[PDB]
Design an enzyme around this catalytic site. Sequence first.
Site, PDB file in Angstrom:
ATOM      1  N   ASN B  10      21.169  32.772  49.564  1.00  0.00           N
ATOM      2  CA  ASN B  10      20.615  31.474  49.927  1.00  0.00           C
ATOM      3  C   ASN B  10      21.546  30.774  50.892  1.00  0.00           C
ATOM      4  OD1 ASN B  10      19.425  28.981  50.167  1.00  0.00           O
ATOM      5  ND2 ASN B  10      19.794  28.363  48.051  1.00  0.00           N
ATOM      6  N   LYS B  12      21.083  28.133  52.494  1.00  0.00           N
ATOM      7  CA  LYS B  12      20.913  26.676  52.439  1.00  0.00           C
ATOM      8  C   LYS B  12      20.820  26.085  53.846  1.00  0.00           C
ATOM      9  CE  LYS B  12      23.269  26.488  47.950  1.00  0.00           C
ATOM     10  NZ  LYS B  12      24.014  25.620  46.979  1.00  0.00           N
ATOM     11  N   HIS B  94      14.425  25.094  43.767  1.00  0.00           N
ATOM     12  CA  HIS B  94      15.883  25.044  43.813  1.00  0.00           C
ATOM     13  C   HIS B  94      16.399  23.722  43.268  1.00  0.00           C
ATOM     14  CE1 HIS B  94      20.061  25.113  45.151  1.00  0.00           C
ATOM     15  NE2 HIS B  94      19.922  26.428  45.195  1.00  0.00           N
ATOM     16  N   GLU B 166      20.128  28.476  37.310  1.00  0.00           N
ATOM     17  CA  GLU B 166      21.205  27.709  37.946  1.00  0.00           C
ATOM     18  C   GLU B 166      21.907  26.859  36.905  1.00  0.00           C
ATOM     19  OE1 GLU B 166      18.423  26.061  41.259  1.00  0.00           O
ATOM     20  OE2 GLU B 166      20.463  26.028  42.075  1.00  0.00           O
TER      21      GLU B 166
END
EC number: 5.3.1.1
Lengths: 242, 243
Positions: B10, B12, B94, B166
């Site tokens: 990821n 981002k 996310h 997460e």
Amino acid sequence: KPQPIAAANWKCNGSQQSLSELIDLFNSTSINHDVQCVVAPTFLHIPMTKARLTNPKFQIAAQNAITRSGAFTGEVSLQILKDYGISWVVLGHSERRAYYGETNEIVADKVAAAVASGFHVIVCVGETNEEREAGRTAAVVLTQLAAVAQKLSKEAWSRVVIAYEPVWAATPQQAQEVHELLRRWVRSKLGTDIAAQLRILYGGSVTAKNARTLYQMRDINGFLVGGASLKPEFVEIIEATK
Amino acid sequence: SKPQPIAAANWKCNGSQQSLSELIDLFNSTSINHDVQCVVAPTFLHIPMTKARLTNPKFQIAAQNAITRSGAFTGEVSLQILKDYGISWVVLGHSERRAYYGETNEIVADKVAAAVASGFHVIVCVGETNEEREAGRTAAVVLTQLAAVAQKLSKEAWSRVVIAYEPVWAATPQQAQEVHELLRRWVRSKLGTDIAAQLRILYGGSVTAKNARTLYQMRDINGFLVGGASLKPEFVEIIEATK
């Protein structure tokens, strides 16, 4: 009047094939008068548009941005746009204010960062039907504008463009009155020269059929166009800014 | 026993054309000789260049977010726009989007259902904050997030579903395993033995070349959703930890 702007907000639309066809038309359209054209594709479509658009009177814009790169999954920053050679951005659009939690404060912060980083910004403002019916149009749109203005330096105004969205919806007379309201505030706070140079674009429903009558209003300096901007009729809208 | 592992990057909101092209060259030159699905998730703006240059046969490209439908949604990218572009993986829910961008369980669940319907593999992220963990609400929170997604899906969808945990609250491998096991057991109770056994549950906390193997060793961990390390050559070593 200052140099007009004809801006195409493609919003969340387009396929590689459809947008290629539309860009080819834009490429074959000779823009002969003094007007700045802008097209704002989705982020995903910016690279293909950048590669295919050749018309020297067109600039590419993003439809949104956050200020800085970092741990912001799903977002695109001004830093990344600049790296890709994008220097225009639309901020504070009514749909982002509605769905994506963009407050006057959030919009102002984004605008401040963008113009300080040398972006031209189309800053969107506009009141709801409940606010208009209550007689609060001026209170609302000037509060929006004031929030954005508080950060900006004198020089920064050269890169500011305002777009009025009649979210409540409009006649050219009604649009012209809000544009007058906006320009009056600017003249009062920033002076005659900044007010005279400022482009205030109409961002309501714009079509080939109503564009000329709108452009003829004294304080309308062009358009931020929605659906019509995905169609060949966008050519006629650019022509209406003569 | 374990299903095919996933090593997901990821990126981002990061990257320049230059920096990412160097990263993509490194991934392209990396020989990977075991069964693993690698995924890279660039920003929308970088997806075109990544699609055009990425060649490593173990990699797929993912979006970092999407909305359900095309239309009057200024600033957003829809699942159909991604699909027209040939993207078939997406990261949804996310932690940063739940926190910053108003993504509720219902919003995430609607997006996930739409993505699966349109042929995407989805990495669905769940996770609890420090306040929630300290209150003893870890299980309640992640299973609520999970159940909201599950309610909008039926058993057929699950072949294309991947879960990522997460630990926003931060974790030890045991702490990760405790949540992964709780997630898988919930799935087993609702969807059956086969679905639960085949499900990939990825760890999406801080992953490094150093700690990756110890994490992969846990019974219910099937790989990683990697943050900052995924912008570095260290990601290569993380892939190796799934072997």
